[PDB]
Every structure is written in structure tokens, then in C-alpha cells.
Design a protein around this ligand. Sequence first.
Ligand SMILES: CC(=O)SCCNC(=O)CCNC(=O)[C@H](O)C(C)(C)COP(=O)(O)OP(=O)(O)OC[C@H]1O[C@@H](n2cnc3c(N)ncnc32)[C@H](O)[C@@H]1OP(=O)(O)O
Lengths: 41, 156
Amino acid sequence: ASQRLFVLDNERYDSFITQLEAPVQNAEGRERLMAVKPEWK
Amino acid sequence: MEINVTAPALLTDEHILQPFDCGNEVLSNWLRGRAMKNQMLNASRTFVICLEDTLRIVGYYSLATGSVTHAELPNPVPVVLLGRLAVDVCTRGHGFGKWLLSDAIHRVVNLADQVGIKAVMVHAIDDDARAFYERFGFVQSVVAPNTLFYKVLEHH
Ligand SMILES: CC(=O)SCCNC(=O)CCNC(=O)[C@H](O)C(C)(C)COP(=O)(O)OP(=O)(O)OC[C@H]1O[C@@H](n2cnc3c(N)ncnc32)[C@H](O)[C@@H]1OP(=O)(O)O
């Protein structure tokens, strides 16, 4: 299993590019992740 | 109880895998049945965390490269698939989940200074998965109903 190659139709591919190239979304959750400070041993 | 864990490290043959249980049989079975095989084929890189001073894995995540292309012959856009991420049932609530995810994303960001990577993609099997990923910056993707993505920016 585990799919590595995603083949989209040309209309979906273009949406994918648009959403990929848009300004970042969910900046809120994204500042959360950057704020995580692990305490590995 | 205060539980301490070692920094994420590549899975080897010396790590102890049988105790691991995350409550999801496909994720525990993948760790035991496919992780080390993919590791030796250079298909994936699996990183594990262990109870301090043991090789007892209590957490892991897996990384692999992937591509998104269109119906005809960047022709594929390059992504990194964060294909599995799981914390042991016995070690929930200690922040290891967000620690693993922070490590994986930081690994991919520095990675993307070496080769072109446009995003990290995850597959949320369930709604709690989705809630976790969305809490930390992932976004619904148009490539699949369960697939989310975390945009990688330009180098710093
Ligand atoms: C690609 C995939 O594998 S998708 C499926 C992902 N993995 C799984 O579903 C495996 C089953 N569950 C797990 O392995 C673990 O529950 C994980 C990795 C989701 C969470 O690890 P845990 O230790 O449970 O979480 P942790 O203690 O790190 O919680 C970090 C934060 O996330 C929050 N949180 C944890 N689980 C969830 C969830 N399912 N949905 C929303 N928020 C969550 C916690 O409240 C905590 O909040 P905080 O930022 O205020 O501290």
C-alpha cells in the first residue's frame, strides 16, 4: 500500500497548484507547531 | 508518571518493536512488518523514539518522497509524504505526539534546503487524526478527501 504518486485530472491538478501557490493557510496551527519545544533525552 | 524518551533516531534492527501499541492495528503492524524492509530498500526513513535507556519504541514516524502529476506525461510537483505517525497507547498525553510532528516538520524543512520540496502531505485515517494535524498547521488538500498538506516555504 502507501500511495506515492498522485495523478490528478487537469482541473483538479490546477486547483492543487493554486492552493499550493496561495499564501499559507492555517497560520494559527502553524505558529502552534513552531512553538513546540521537545525535551528529548 | 514522568516518562522520558530519547530523541528521534532511525529505526535499526536492535530496536524492540513487539511491545508497541497505538490502538490502530495497521500502524502497529506496519512498524513490525514493513518499516525495516522499507528502511533497507531506501524506500522510506522511519524515525522512532524510545523509553529513556531502552530500545523500547513508544513512538515513530515515517518519511518518503512523493509526486503529484496531471493526466498527461515542475512536471510532477515534489512533496514529502509523512505516511505514519503514532504514539504508544501507554504514553499518550505527554506531548510526544506534537514533539514527533515538530521533529518531522523540522526535518523536512532543512531537507527542503537540499532538494526542492513543495509540501508535506499526510493521510488522516480518522477524524481525531485530522483534528491533530489541523491543530498544527495542516490544510485540506484537493488530491484526496483524507489528504492534508503543510506548505514548505522558501529557504528561511
Ligand atoms: C499519518 C497518520 O498516522 S494519521 C493518524 C495519526 N496517528 C494516529 O491516529 C495514531 C493514534 N493516536 C496517536 O498516535 C496519538 O494520539 C497522537 C499522535 C494523535 C497524539 O499523541 P498524544 O500524546 O495523544 O498527543 P500529545 O500529548 O502530543 O498532544 C499534543 C496536543 O495535541 C492535542 N491533541 C492530541 N490528540 C488530538 C486529536 N486527536 N485531535 C485534536 N487535538 C489533539 C492535545 O490536547 C495536546 O494539546 P496542547 O497543544 O494544548 O498540549
